[PDB]
Amino acid sequence: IKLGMAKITQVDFPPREIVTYTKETQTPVMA
Amino acid sequence: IKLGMAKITQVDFPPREIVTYTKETQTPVMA
Amino acid sequence: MEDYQAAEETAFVVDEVSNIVKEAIESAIGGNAYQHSKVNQWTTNVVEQTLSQLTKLGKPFKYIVTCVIMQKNGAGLHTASSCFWDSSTDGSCTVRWENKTMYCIVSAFGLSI
Amino acid sequence: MEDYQAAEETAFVVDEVSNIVKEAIESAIGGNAYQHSKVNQWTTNVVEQTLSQLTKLGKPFKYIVTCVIMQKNGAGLHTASSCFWDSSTDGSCTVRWENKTMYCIVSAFGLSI
Amino acid sequence: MCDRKAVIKNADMSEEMQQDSVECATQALEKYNIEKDIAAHIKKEFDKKYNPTWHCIVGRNFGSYVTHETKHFIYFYLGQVAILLFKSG
Amino acid sequence: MCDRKAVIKNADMSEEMQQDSVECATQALEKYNIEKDIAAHIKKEFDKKYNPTWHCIVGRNFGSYVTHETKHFIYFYLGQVAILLFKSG
Amino acid sequence: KVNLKYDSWHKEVLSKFGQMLGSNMTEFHSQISKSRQELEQHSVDTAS
Amino acid sequence: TSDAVTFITYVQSLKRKIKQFEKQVELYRNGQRLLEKQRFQFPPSWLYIDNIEGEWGAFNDIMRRKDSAIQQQVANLQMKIVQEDRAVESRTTDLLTDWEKTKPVTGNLRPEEALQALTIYEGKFGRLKDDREKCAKAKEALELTDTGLLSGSEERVQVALEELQDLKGVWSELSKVWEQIDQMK
């Protein structure tokens, strides 16, 4: 048994973020 | 070496669903 | 030629441990949506099924199974695991699993005595 | 007087590892908010600092350090760990931690030779 | 100003944020005439005051569902122009 | 519907699922006339195939300033009837 | 004059409630921070 | 279990009241558009059938989701009924043997400490009977009701309570006898 430092096992699940788009729409005031 | 089972070590933190209601809207027809 | 078979009988193959993790995840979770009262018994049954199928191998190991089960809410997740073992015999296995509602990470370890 | 601290230096003293965990967490993360680019540095620094000062105890163990770090966005945190050791010598340390913005669980182990 | 009475057709709010919705829709109705600018002022003021993410819909003829948070819904009428307001996201 | 010509004003969602939005609003204006019933059918369809949480407004005279997810946004006219489909939450 | 002076009396009871709450809050911040810094500097894993 | 059980009993009380609630909403519906038809100018302090249908549809949405929360909590609270029923059985059998062997029965001891021991076992059986009641309400409101599933432990704690009524009564008759003995000593 030769003790040693192991590999740093990484799992990253990122916050799957939306940069959320805000858009204006308009019904074109129809007579 | 009597190898045996260990206990389950659980740390629980609760989520929320930030409480969702579906409501329904309608502009009227007018008189 | 018997020393190679004796080394293969006590080696940590990552793929067999990962298949045991896949069968324990698909046995206990399935594809059912996140119910947080069931997350306790899902973590309990994945760790207990992985500890059951790992101890049926008969290899001289000490096994550590840690499990992370997590709802998809747009929240962020890092799990890290560096350890301190003998590098000639010991190894690890960390498996990312997901479905529609949930992320499941199981880190499985096997350390020779 | 000497054999009792020799028994302290040989068995798995469970929660001086928790002092190493809080010094690793308070060195790495601090009181910073969640920004996801530093979370990999924070998980790696907690795990490397915990493997730094468990190796300076001078105790003949194999150490496994796992660390889960979680964004507070309404997603709630559950982990589990049951293992397979020799029960009189080995044990498990698991510390939960949080602030306003972040969660943290570090689970740490020591397995005798 | 002719008296634009606020009839509340649906109310899942608090009463302070109900009267602030009445005042902010009155302010957005006196500043603007296109309904998307009215929804722009209401949604910008309530993301400023009561955090992301609200959604605001202003008009005279629409029939819609919402899906809102708890205490985060009003659908009300100022004159004959309706104001729909709910927080989601 | 009949000679209404589904014309997209604004689209951030994919073309098969924009086509699903066009045929879902077409079949929803086929089986209902009242716009909130159209909206509730569009709610249950989009919430069963592209999950919670969609929000949609059916009508002919409205304005909005609303916040969507990316790959989850159409505003199109079925003639006079405008259909504003977005996901948030 | 009742409504003006009674708004001022609400402000005075409000302000002295804020001053007593801030004095109890500063005192609690002092003893809780002193206690948790004593928990930080004393390790239980000392030898004696 | 039991605080959510009192909430589910409160839910079922509102479920028995919901026909009165729905006919109340219909009465305010008819009266409110009658006042629209007879041209009553409503105040803004009036909360309308618009607002009552908002609160009422909200109320129906919350009870449909909390009904769904009940119907997923039947498994967790069913196994909590199992552990609390067998825990009442275990602590029942422990306090039956502790009661039945460490009671004072006889006529050679001072009755104040004797009746003190009877009232410690009376309060201990009161807490154990309240645990049995909390489990019995849990089998009432969560619909694992099979004659309430009144256990063997409910019968055992109640016959020990009746035995303690017998022993508190004969220790009261003996306490009159020991006050006579303190006079004649």
Numbering used by the authors:
A (entry chain J), B (entry chain I): 110 to 140
C (entry chain L), D (entry chain K): 1 to 113
E (entry chain E), F (entry chain D): 1 to 89
G (entry chain A): 1115 to 1162
H (entry chain G): 1163 to 1347
Lines quoted from the article behind this entry:
It functions as a ~4 MDa complex containing its cofactor dynactin and a cargo-specific coiled-coil adaptor. The formation of dynein-dynactin-adaptor (DDA) complexes is a key regulatory step in dynein activation.
Our cryo-EM structure shows two distinct globular densities below both dynein-A and B heavy chains (residues 1160-1230). The resolution of our maps in this region was ~9 Å which is sufficient to identify them as belonging to the IC-LC tower based on its crystal structure. In each IC-LC tower, LC8 binds to the dynein heavy chain-1 (A1/B1) while TCTEX1 binds to the dynein heavy chain-2 (A2/B2). Such a configuration suggests that the IC-LC tower plays a structural role. Firstly, the interaction with the DHCs reinforces the dynein tails lying parallel to one another. The IC-LC towers are docked beneath the DHCs of both dynein-A and dynein-B. As the two differ in motor-conformation and binding to LIS1, it suggests neither factor affects the IC-LC interaction. In our structure the LC8 interaction is the same whereas the additional TCTEX1 interaction is only possible because of the parallel arrangement of the DHC. The location of dynein-B DIC-Ns is not clear as they remain unresolved in our structure raising the question of how they are sequestered in the DDA complex.
